[PDB]
C-alpha cells in the first residue's frame, strides 16, 4: 500500500476557519451559544440571518463536493 489534509494544503482550513469566524460573528450579532454557532458552522462544513446561513450552507456544500472530487482525484 495524509492525503485528506494535503488536498486542503492547510490553507483551506484556516480560510474556512476565519470565514466561519466572521460568519459566526455576524450570526452572533444577528457563551455556549457561540460554541453552538461554531458547532453549526462546522456542522455545515461536514454537511451534517436565515439567508446568510442558507448561502453559507450552499457554499459549504459546493466546497464539500469540490473537496471530495479533488481528494478522490489526488488520491
Amino acid at each position: 500500500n495524509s492525503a485528506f489534509l494535503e488536498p486542503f494544503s492547510a490553507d483551506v482550513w484556516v480560510m474556512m476557519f476565519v470565514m466561519l469566524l466572521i460568519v459566526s460573528a455576524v450570526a452572533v450579532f444577528v457563551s455556549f451559544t457561540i460554541g453552538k454557532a461554531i458547532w453549526l458552522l462546522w456542522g455545515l462544513v461536514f454537511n451534517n440571518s436565515k439567508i446568510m446561513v442558507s448561502v453559507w450552507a450552499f457554499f459549504a456544500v459546493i466546497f464539500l463536493a469540490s473537496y471530495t472530487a479533488n481528494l478522490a482525484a489526488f488520491m
Binding site: 466572521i22 460568519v23 455576524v26 440571518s49 446568510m52
Partner: peptide, 21 residues
C-alpha cells in the same frame, strides 16, 4: 467576505424594510 458584507447589507436593508412596514 464580500458576499458576507453585502449579505449583511442586504439583511440590513431587508430588516429596515420590515421595520418600516
Amino acid at each position: 467576505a464580500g458576499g458576507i458584507v453585502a449579505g449583511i447589507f442586504l439583511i440590513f436593508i431587508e430588516i429596515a424594510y420590515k421595520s418600516r412596514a
